[PDB]
Structures are given as C-alpha cells and as structure tokens.
Design a protein around this ligand. Structure first.
Ligand SMILES: [Cl-]
Ligand SMILES: [Cl-]
Ligand SMILES: [Cl-]
Ligand SMILES: [Cl-]
Ligand SMILES: [Cl-]
Ligand SMILES: [Cl-]
Ligand SMILES: [Cl-]
Lengths: 414, 470, 282, 465
C-alpha cells in the first residue's frame, strides 16, 4: 500500500518536473514516497546540463497535514529519509502530494539534512509545486562539478553472488592405514593393478577416500584388515589439523576426477584448466548465465603462437561446520594446447590487464556451473549447492555513472 | 550472509571541521593543529637542472594549479596554491644554502658502472654524503627532496613491462637504511613529473604525457607528513588517545642464517607511527612462517606501549593488534600478558588476510562499493578498494579484491566494528591524497620498514619515527 | 718380478669353488668413452646492460618486436649473448649504447661467479636453439628430448656408431603412452675449456604431446632394465646429434678414447658367471 | 690427453700381519687384527619370546657353520666356516643369562593398533628404551643388544616403498637410547638381517652371507677391530675427518655442524660443532673460519684423548664445496697443532660425468680418470675378485675435487678414498660407494636431529650404528 501510493505521488511529481524543463531520475523508495534527482535539461537538444537538485516525494491519500487551514499548514520531517543525502552536498527539496485534492507543495530542506529543524512551515500560496517553479528550482541546483559534490549510492541496494559453493559430502568416509607413508610412494604399486583411480589421500601412513578401497585396485595400497567406514561428519568437522588438511586434499582430488571430462589439474601451478582435445584448435563450453544459455571459448587457439585455456584456483574452506569450494578464475597458456608455453607469465599479464568486472563475474558463474553440472547426469561422490545471493544495502549508481563518468567505457569487458 | 556498506570514514581537519576527503577537508578547514608561521624547510639534492626544475614546480604549486578536466573534479581537483587558500596553512620554502648539487660527472660515473649492485652502492654512498653535508648546520631541513636525473633513476631502478626480490639491490631500500641515522626523511621524485620514484618498478621508456594539480597535492602532502605535521585525525567521534593500533610483522635477513626479525608498527588516530624492532622469530617449517614466542611477543608489545608512553605521556586504554598471519597461541598469550600487566583491559587481535580468494560480485561493469562488508560466520569480507561514490567512479582498472578479517577469540569487539576501523585505517596516507587504499596503515608500514631494516644489522638501535622510513 | 701375476690369486704354482681363489684378470688394457664433448666458443661474445633485472622481465618487451630469438641471458641487469643483439629484436631489451663485443675467453674463463653462471646459462640456451630441429627442452624436467612429430606415431633418428650407420626409435609409439629419448645436459669447465656432459634418460607422454599422468613411475620401469651397452649407445647417439648440429654458433669436438691399463675379463666371465645374462640390455 | 689409472683393490692387514683384499677371506685365514685369549662379545636380546628364541637358534646355527648356495661365485657368496676351530673372528658370541627382555604380545598389539604413525613410533621407542634401560641395570652389562621385533611390528613402524614428514622409528630409537651407552642392532626375525635402515618392501619375499654380516656388525659394535687399512707408508698416522650438517625441525630450523673422525683401524669419533651459517634462504650450510677452527680443534682433542697421540696427517672430507672461511679455519687449527699434512677433498655423489667400456659388464671398480684437477673414481663397478658386477643398475662414479690447500696429488687421494669405502659396519661386501666418514655423516645427522642442541653426546660411533 505504501509502495503504490508512493508511485502515485512520484508520477504526479514526475509529470510536473518534465513540464518545468528538468529530467527526473528515480533513485529508490521511501516510507510513503520516493527518492529521486532533478537535472536541468537543454530545452532544444534535451541534453542534461549538469545542475542537480535532490527531490523526496511524500504522498498521502485524503489526509490532513498538521494544523492545516486554507492558508497554510505544517509538516514533520523524517530524519532517516533526509539522511540519504547527508554528505552529498546536493540541495534537497520535499514535495508533498495528496490524492484527494491533487495538491503539490514543496519546500527547501537542505538545512534539515544537516540539523534538527524538523518542523516545516508551509504557505499554500507561495509553496505551490507546479511548472511555474522553473526559476526557483533552477536557482537551487548545484553544479555536478562543484568540489565536494557527489551522487550517493542508491538506497534500495542490489544483489551479488559469492565465489563459494556448498559441498555436500557423502555420509560415509573410508579410514585405513597404509604400508606407504604418502600417496606419492603408493602410486607405482597402484599402477601394477587394474580397476585403478586416484581420488584418495595417503598421508602419514593413513588413507582416506569416499569410495571403498577394497572394491578397487586401491586394496593393494591399504591395510585391508584396517579398512573402516565412519561417519564423514566426524572426520571432516573436528579440530585435528591432520584430519582437516586431509579433507581439503581428498576434496580436491575427488573434484579432479569428477570434472575430468572437461578440466584437468596442474600439480605445480595448483590450477584446474579446461584441457584441449586437439592441437592448435579452439573449443567452447556452454553454460547457463541467469536464464539464458551462453558460450565461453574455454580453449582459444591463436594460429601460428599459443593456446589460451580458462583456468581457476580451487580453495576448500570450512565455514561453521560446512565445507565450501572457492573459485578464483584465471588463465593458463600452452604452446599448442598441450605443451606448456615457455613464457606464460607474459601472456597471463596480457589478458589479465584488460579483465573487468563483467568478465570476472561471468567466469565465476561458468566455473560454478561446471561444478554443479557434474553432480547430475553427465563416479559422482560430491554434490554442489549454490548459495543465496547477497543483499547489499546500497547499490552502485551505474545508470547515472554511465552518463556522467568519462571512464565508464574503461570499465567495460572487451 | 549478513552484509553492510560502511560509510566513508570521517576525518577531523581542524576547527572541528569534518570531511571524508583529505583534500577537500584541508581546502575547507586547513590542517588539524596549525601554528601561525608554520613553514616546512625543504632541502634539495640533485643536479643544477633538477634543482632549478624543482624550484620551478614549487613555484607553480604556490601559485595554484588548475585541474586538467573537472568532470571528475573530486578525483582530479585543482590545487588552490600556497597563498590565501593554502590547504596546509604552512609555507614550503627552500632555505638559502639548503641545496647540494650532484656533478654531471658523478651522474655519468654511476650510469656507466657495469654491475648493478656496485652502481647502487656508489649512488647510495654519494647521496648519503650530500645528505650529511646538508645537515652539518648548513641549514636545518625538515625534509630533503632527492631530484635525481631521469637517466640516473633509470640506471638505479629496474624496469618491468607495461603489463606487469633480492637478486638485485634495491636503491631506495638501501638508501633509506644507510641514511636512517641521519634524522631526515627523504623524498625521491622524478625530475620531469615530480611524483614518487624508485618505490615501484619503472617502465622501459618515460612517457612525455599530466595531472600537475594531483602531483602537487601528493608532493606537498608527503613533505607535510615527513616534516612531522598532522594533516587530520581519524575516528573523530571516538575519544582521541584511547585506542592505538599495533601492527606486528616480520622481515627476513639475507646474510647470516636468514633469521626472521619481529617488528612493531603502532599508529595513533593522528596517523603518526612508531617503529620498534623485537627479538628474532621462530619459524614453523624449513625457515618459513615466522612467529614469536609468548615471552618475545610480551616483550615486543611492552616495548611498544613504553614508546607510546614516552611520546604521548599516557598509556592507551585499548590496543588493536593487527597481523597478516594468524595469531599463534603463544602470540595471543604473550600479548595478553603484556597488556594485563600494564592495566590495558581492552584489546582486539585481528588477522588481516591480504590474499584471500573469496570475493563477491555485482551485476554490471562497475565493481563492488568500497566499504562493503560481508559477514562469513565470524570472518569479515571487507572491500577497502572498489567503487567510490565520492569520486563518482572506480579509480582503478583491474578489479578490486577484498580483505578477509579474522578476529581472535580473545577480542572484545564485534567483527563489524573492527572492520570499520580497518576501513578507517586505510585513510592514513603518506604517499598520495587519494583515500581509496587497500591496506590499513599498520600493515602497510610493516612491509615498508621490513625492506629497510633488513639492511641494518640486528642489535643496532633504530629510530622509532616512522616518517623517516617513508 | 717373481710370481707377481699370482700375488692375490691364491692359486698354487685348487677348486675354483674354494673361497679365496681368484682367477687373475688377463693383463693388457681396453679403451672407453667419456660422456663429454669439448665446446668451441665463438671468437666474440656480446655483453651489455639492460633496463630489466632478469630475462623473465624482458620477454614482454621482446614479444612487442619482430626478428626475435631466445638464446640470450639477462641476469642482474646484465645481458650476454653470442649473437649481436643490435641486429635482432633483442635491441629492445638492451641498452644499445652499452653493447660491446669482447673476447669470449675473457667472459667464459675467469674467476667471477656471475660470469661463470651466465656462461653456463647462455651455453644451455644456445644449445637448445641449435638443437631445436630434433629435440625440445623441458623447463620443469630440465630435459632435452626428441619431440613427437605426429600424434601417436613413432620416428627414428639416423646416426653413426663406430663407422657403421645405425638408427634408434627416439620416439616410440605403442598405440597408453609414448616414450621419448631424453637426456640431461651439464656444462662443466675443466682447466680453460668448456664441455657439455650428456646423461641419457627417457620422457613419457600420453599421445606424443599430452603429458602423461605420473610418468615418474613409467620411468622406473624402463630404467630398471637398463644396462651398460644401452647407456653407452645412448651416449654415442646424443654425442652424434651435438657434433652433427654444427653442419649455428657452437661447435663440438669428440674427445680421444681413454686408455685403461686393465680390462674387464668379459669374454671369460660370459662362461663362468651365472649372472652374465643379467648384464645384457634386453 | 686424460691420464688414467685402475687402482689395485686396496689391501687390508689382519692378524699376525696377514694381508688380503677381502675382509671375509682375510678373517678366515688370519683372524682379527688384535685378538686376545678369551675374546667374547656379549649379546643382549630384546623381542618377543618367539623372536628371542628364534635369534638364539640362528646364533647356534651360525656357530655350527653355514654353506654357500651359489659356489660358482664363491668369493661373492662364501660359506661361513662357523664359530669353532675355523672361527674367523677368533671370538665367542654369547647371550648371557638374564640378558634378554621380553615384549608381551599385548604390548605388541597395542602399538600395532595405534592410529597415528607418529604416536605408534614414539610409544614403541619409549617401550624399547625402557627394556633397554633394564637390561643395562642388570649386572650383565651386554656389549651389543639385538632388537628382534616381530614382523607385524616392524611392518607397522617402517614405511614401504616398493623424510621429515613422518617419524623414522630407527632414527628416534637411536637418539633416545644414545645415553644408555649400548649399541643396538635391529633385525628381521625370519632372515636375521638389518631392518628399519631402509624402506621395507610392501610384501616380504644367502644365509651364510647374512651370518657373516650379522657377526661383523656385532663385532664392530662391541668395539673390536677386524682389520686395518694398509697405509702407503709406515712413518705417520692419518686421520680422516668428515664434516657434515643436519637441520633442526623445531625452533628456527638452524643447521648444526658435525664431525666424523675415523682412524686407520676403522673407528670413528663423533663431535657436534657450532650452528652453521647458510647461503640463501636457510640452505647451503657452512661454517665460519672461527667455528671450523673450533670443530677441527675439538676433533683432534677427542682423537688425542682416545689415542694418546696426535695424527701427522688429517684428511677433511665434505659433500659440499669448501668455503674460503672453512678452508681458512681448518688451516688455522692444524697449524696451531703443528699438523703439517692435510687434504681437503670435496666428494660429489651426483655428478653426471661417466666413462663407458664396450660390453655388457660395467667399468672396473677402482677406475680413476684425471679430469684436469678433478678425480673421477669408480668405487662401484666390476669386481674381478667377485668374478662379476655385484649389482644390476649401471654404477656411477664419484667426482673428487681436492681444494687447492691440499698437499697430496690427485691420484693418491683417490686411492685413499677407494680404501675408505671398505671400512664397513653393515655388510661384508667391500664394494661400497661412499667412504666411511661421509657415510657416517648421513647416519649421524639423522640421529642427532632428535637430540636437543647443546646436549652432550657420546663420541663413540659404534653407538650410532
Ligand atoms: Cl568435452
Ligand atoms: Cl665530480
Ligand atoms: Cl630467457
Ligand atoms: Cl638463475
Ligand atoms: Cl694404473
Ligand atoms: Cl706409527
Ligand atoms: Cl653407483
């Protein structure tokens, strides 16, 4: 009810503002009205001029203001509403609108933005808000290029996505001792058998995996009589440094196998990267950004030369008895799609220099899509869960900035 | 996940004047505590050209410099000059006989040395002598500007490509260490644009471009800070001299056994820093992950509070300790022992992660607002860099990456209060007048003094004045 | 003098299966080959300063220009190469007025640590380019290996052993891995001469180009069965590849065979040793 | 023009001036160097009732003699002639009464069931150190104590492979029992050969050779001298001083210098010096001239206290190059002591330089090649006295680089290094790769890293073996 009524008052005020020779820009909502900006308009070209006046509309249906007669009335100001302009150094006017009579009254309230003058005095004769106020409002505007003046962020806020995906572990994890001290020592024994797989950890003679080691070739590298299935809640959520470190290690190797159709792992660089399928040939990955499908050239060959692969760093972090995977996008460069380039650092700095927000955000969405997608039907031990969006209390005025910031193009992802 | 967008931290500028922007606040109110007749005496070392070139730029600075483009007037302001609208309310004067000239041959001699390490050592020895001669009662300079010729800086400073250690000596780091016993802060500037030099890698070729007004702001603010004057004060609402911020860091020696040494960087709300050198550190694995024992952390905190008491004559009521590595149980124990002994009943231990991969992303081309704070179940994601409403843009090009703040369980304060203070501590600036810096001052000073103190032998007493390390 | 030949024999002058008796090895010597090749440096070497501290920092500026090559070294703001940097794209990464052609022996044969290390580094990069037709260089593995030419296809290198022509499957295809003949190169200074040392090994990929997963374990299988005649032959082959390549800035000379005063009684041992079959390369 | 040499297999002196190249054949013919009437080595045993009785039966079968199972290579696989009239050690090997300690089968299953490897090792060491202590309190006072842990317990404590991350059972056992002042010998209970020294096989697969090696090791640990190196002259004594380093795990991970001082009778003295400096980022350990002076001075003093004479020649062996400070400090100590003969030899184990003969058998052991100031020495290779190459993988030579302060010529030093490879406390096969002082540096460093710096340590090397 408050919302609709506010859009009614804003629409009435917006209609007058356009007749008066100004541009109206909506900014946010208020208790009973709206928050907006007024800008002077070139009468012929319609172009913005750069002179600003903040406007707050308060609307009411058929209600009488304080101590109202036929000659004037009084009004009590809302400090939280005026506080959105506390440091902007932009002048503010309030415009009171009523649905019964259709009356619009306005008053300059900059002095109440920085003080405690809450009692307003209105004179229905001189305080009328209508197209005849062009000269009065124009004299109240401030230049956008006056030192200390800035447009504040939007009070309605916006959403944002995090680079964290919740991991859902299986209920059981397999404990064992091993003849080998580390997995590095156990691999040559494992390769001597068949039915092999590498999503397991052996550190300090202890073995961990989400699959049963006795049902695969891993039986040759474990003490079979000491294999034991425990509740994965106890292993993955305790205070023991050895256990949390081995959980992070097992989570990574499990992820490595689960995503092996699309990406491979680089041990030295600690990087997951979309591998090539043919030398000197590009390929794309199809994922869902928002409600629309989109393609990213995860392997991009530049014919002779080098081949650029979409890469990412995975960190597994525990937050309040839950495990999460963090995705940090980057790139990896080969000479032909497989052979590593002998000077990759130079190429990474080249692509990273031009990276902007939209591109980085899109890579996070794509990598998070690849993680969640591998749990459904593409052997699958980990499920991944998207987090709710973050509700930020203040939003970047991008729409305003794309007009006014001379560097708005430098922010675009080429 | 709880999210807040902090207001830009307010600063007190004098006569009670309050503003979020260091530049605009100085223009409107002046500095915090000016005295009638304030003057910064500036010595100059360089060649005849660069000395005369610096005198020219100081004159245009005094006359006032217009902005190149006033579309982003807050990010690209005018400089109102050093007259009636002097933002520092202070004179900047080169006294008579306060200039030492480097001969044309001395410049060529260094440029021609084939081994880089020898060229640096010869340059440091040359400038240290000219510095010492200037301080032999010739004048009493409060700060000395080093205007080395462009080819000399290019000889001494390695180049990195436009896109983009200890294998080579760092001229700036060795110079600051070799001249620390002389009680002068120095400012190395390029003799063409008059901005900071030798602190970061240079480009292969110098551009001919301008933003002279901004460079004037940055140069005078650096000379102002180096002279020991306070431009403004942080946390205006909070009672002053109550809370102090004690950064604890480590640097690794190069000779001997490559032992680590603990350092302390304690700042007040007036942006003044005290630098103290503690005991050698333990290490967790193979000489890495430096840490302090409880006895050594106790000693370092106690030596720090004592230096705070010698300069401010009273003991702080709260001490926020900042580290870039997690607090060892020994460190938390030693800090508590030292503070309880001195009767300091309020303390917060904050682990500040510079390189956390966790990030949050908004929909659009502009990045997250600076001051955005996301509570990640006891871990604080804080955006000290990002979109700045006051500037009307995002001043960077590469995307920002947030800090991750992890307060210790021994802390008294809530996570959101500590994050806001960390945000405020990023405003203490000795190098620029643009307030959107990533690191809080105690952590920034740790890296800067570590690069200098590793050239001063362990056991040698060092000056506590941070302004002489900048 | 006297019965010197039978000094340690403990054979009267007994059963061979009596402890202590040892058939004296037939006197007279045999020859042998060292895994070393003398390196003849060019007359001149080019030294200069550089705006970049290291060669890694200089590469992005080198890529911005044309006529590039990578057989150069930049360390501690000092550039060295056997070719003139002013006549190639390397002009962008040197101080051109500091470029100076000096005698090679001054730089390569002195007591300076940095000069000796930069000489070793330049020799390795000059060799890598001079051998780029037949072998590539691995940065992590620090190996020279005969690169695969076609996916999952074998090939052979054609060299000379003794005075008889021979060949070897330097890239061997089994059509779940492929093994490449590899070697570690070491550059050693003996008196006032530089030598390259050749130490053969192998390198394992998947299809010829894709690195194999855990090739360390595939290596130990083939190294386990390697015996003298195999290692000696690989030394001879790599030594031929290096001498052949100068047919270019570096030349390689073969060393004389070493004259050993005593000889392994191999002919006798093949009859008497129950392990003689364990000594041959399968 | 590369000068070449093939050294004779260095000769050893046995009892009554008897001479032979083979320690086994020499003891068979002449007996040990300095035998006495009634010579006995008292052997204590720690293990289970099964393994204690099993070891007592292997000692008895050894005394009765064991025959070779490959008489076509008789010198490499000799018989053991027994402990009777043909006793090569001319000494008795006897387990005294009450010199046995039993580990209960409940104590075995407790350690075998410990989850963490590091906790099972520390508990097993503390248990054996208790049994070790008790036997010593008993008036038996054995000379050497054999540790016969059952096969499942060794397999628990020893990693398989078909080092600082996990505790090494053997290293921590030697460190924690070093103060008890008795050498120990860990053995497998089925084959009675050395255990826990190297990684075991994941699945356990000549008896006379194992008898030879077991007795030679107990003979050495008891302190008796089987033979001595035959010096190339008869005027003065030479001492071989190995200088090494080991790194701490706690604290600041500082390095500590060690000294391994061996005489021509094969006996070593172990000293700890000052903390080492490092070159880059805590790596490449080295000593200052002052600390190298002190270390060599402390080693000479210990040698004098045990021998009542100062050697006229000191050979210093290192696995890393001699820093100028190290060479300066070594010269200062020796000159102060009036020692006028010295050699500083850098021994490189991993050089890629090699020499290749034409055939299937590798280069002869003892082959030396002068590489213009650097000595290529094949300490392993074809052994004529064995009639074969005792190995399978091709051998790789040592590279000997004498410092310029050395007094000897290159060829003479290489033959000396070849002879030092025969001082050997773990086997009776003489074709060993490393000379004894360097071999001791590795073993000694793995043990002392578990003993806090500044703690007095025993000087007798037989207690570290
Ligand atoms: Cl695919
Ligand atoms: Cl001059
Ligand atoms: Cl390069
Ligand atoms: Cl290097
Ligand atoms: Cl000879
Ligand atoms: Cl004598
Ligand atoms: Cl070998």
């Amino acid at each position: 009810d408050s919302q609709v009524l506010g859009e009614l008052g804003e629409t009435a005020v917006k209609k007058i503002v356009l007749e008066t020779g100004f541009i109206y820009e909506h900014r946010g909502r208020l208790e009973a009205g709206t928050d907006g900006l007024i800008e002077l308009r070139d009468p012929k070209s319609g172009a913005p001029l750069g002179k600003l006046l903040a406007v707050q509309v308060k609307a009411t249906k058929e209600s009488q203001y304080l101590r109202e007669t036929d000659k004037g009335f009084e009004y009590l100001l809302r400090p939280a509403d005026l506080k959105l302009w506390r440091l902007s150094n932009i002048p503010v006017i309030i415009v009171l609108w009523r649905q019964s009579d259709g009356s619009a009254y306005w008053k300059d309230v900059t002095d109440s933005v920085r003080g405690e003058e809450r009692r307003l005095q209105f004179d229905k004769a001189a305080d009328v808000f209508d197209p005849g106020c062009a000269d009065r409002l124009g004299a109240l505007t401030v230049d956008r290029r006056k030192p200390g003046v800035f447009v504040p962020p939007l009070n309605g806020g916006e959403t944002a996505i995090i680079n964290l995906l919740r991991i859902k572990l299986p209920e059981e994890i397999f404990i064992a001792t091993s003849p080998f001290g580390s997995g590095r020592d156990a691999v040559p024994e494992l390769l001597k058998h068949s039915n092999t797989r590498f999503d397991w950890v052996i550190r300090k003679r202890r073995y961990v995996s989400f699959f049963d080691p006795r049902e695969y070739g891993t039986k040759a590298i474990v003490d079979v009589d000491q294999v034991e299935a425990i509740d994965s809640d106890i292993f993955a959520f305790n205070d023991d440094l050895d256990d949390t470190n081995d959980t992070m290690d097992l989570l990574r190797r499990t992820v490595e196998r689960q995503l092996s159709a699309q990406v491979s792992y680089l041990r030295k660089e600690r990087l997951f990267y979309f591998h090539a399928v043919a030398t000197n040939k590009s390929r794309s990955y199809r994922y869902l950004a928002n409600v629309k499908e989109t393609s990213a050239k995860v392997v991009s060959a530049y014919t002779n030369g080098y081949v650029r692969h979409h890469a990412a760093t995975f960190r597994f972090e525990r937050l309040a008895d839950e495990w999460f995977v963090v995705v940090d996008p980057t790139f990896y460069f080969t000479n032909d799609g497989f052979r590593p380039h002998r000077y990759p650092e130079a190429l990474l700095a080249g692509k990273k220099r031009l990276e902007r927000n939209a591109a980085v955000r899109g890579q996070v969405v794509m990598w998070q899509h690849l993680l969640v997608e591998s749990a459904s039907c593409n052997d699958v031990l980990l499920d991944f869960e998207n987090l709710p969006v973050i509700e930020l209390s203040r939003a970047v005025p991008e729409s305003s900035w794309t007009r006014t910031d001379p560097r708005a193009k430098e922010m675009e992802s080429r | 996940l709880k999210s807040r967008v902090f207001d830009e931290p307010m600063l007190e500028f004098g006569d009670g004047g309050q503003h979020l922007d260091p530049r605009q606040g100085l223009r409107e109110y002046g500095p915090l505590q000016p005295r009638s007749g304030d003057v910064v005496h500036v010595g100059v070392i360089g060649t005849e050209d660069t000395i005369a070139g610096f005198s020219e730029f100081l004159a245009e600075t005094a006359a006032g410099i217009d902005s190149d483009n006033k579309q982003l007037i807050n990010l690209n302001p005018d400089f109102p000059g050093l007259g009636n609208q002097n933002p520092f309310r202070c004179k900047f004067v080169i006294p008579d006989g306060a200039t030492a000239t480097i001969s044309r041959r001395q410049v060529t001699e260094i440029k021609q040395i084939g081994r880089h390490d020898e060229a640096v050592r010869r340059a440091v020895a040359l400038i240290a002598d000219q510095l010492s001669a200037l301080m032999e009662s010739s004048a009493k300079p409060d700060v000395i500007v080093l205007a080395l010729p462009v080819p000399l800086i290019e000889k001494l400073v390695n180049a990195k490509s436009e896109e983009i250690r200890d294998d080579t000596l760092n001229f700036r780091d060795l110079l600051k260490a070799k001249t620390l016993h002389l009680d002068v802060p120095t400012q190395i500037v390029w003799p063409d644009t008059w901005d900071d030099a030798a602190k970061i890698p240079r480009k292969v070729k110098r551009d001919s471009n301008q933003a002279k007004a901004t460079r004037a702001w940055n140069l005078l603010n650096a000379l102002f800070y180096k002279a020991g004057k306070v431009p403004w004060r942080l946390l205006p609402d909070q009672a002053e001299y109550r809370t102090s911020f004690l950064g604890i860091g480590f640097y690794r020696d190069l000779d001997g056994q490559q032992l680590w040494t603990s350092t302390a960087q304690m700042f007040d709300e007036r942006g003044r820093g005290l630098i103290l050198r503690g005991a050698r550190a333990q290490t967790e694995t193979k000489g890495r992950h430096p840490y302090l024992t409880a006895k050594d952390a106790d000693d370092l905190v106690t030596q720090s509070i004592a230096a705070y008491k010698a300069h401010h004559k009273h003991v702080p009521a709260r001490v926020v300790v900042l580290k870039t590595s997690r607090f060892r149980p020994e460190e938390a124990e030693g800090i508590d022992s030292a503070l309880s002994r001195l009767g300091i009943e309020l303390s917060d231990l904050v682990w500040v992660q510079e390189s956390s991969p966790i990030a949050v992303f908004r929909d659009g081309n502009y990045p997250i607002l600076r001051g955005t704070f996301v509570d990640l179940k006891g871990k604080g994601l804080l955006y000290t860099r990002g979109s700045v409403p006051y500037y009307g843009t995002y001043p960077g090009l590469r995307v920002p990456r947030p800090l991750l703040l992890v307060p210790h369980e021994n802390s008294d304060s809530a996570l959101a209060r500590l994050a806001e203070e960390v945000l405020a501590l990023t405003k203490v600036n000795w190098n620029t007048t643009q307030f959107d810096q990533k690191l809080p001052a105690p952590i920034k000073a740790a890296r800067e003094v570590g690069r200098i103190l590793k050239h001063i032998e362990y056991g040698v007493a060092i000056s506590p004045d941070f302004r002489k390390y900048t």
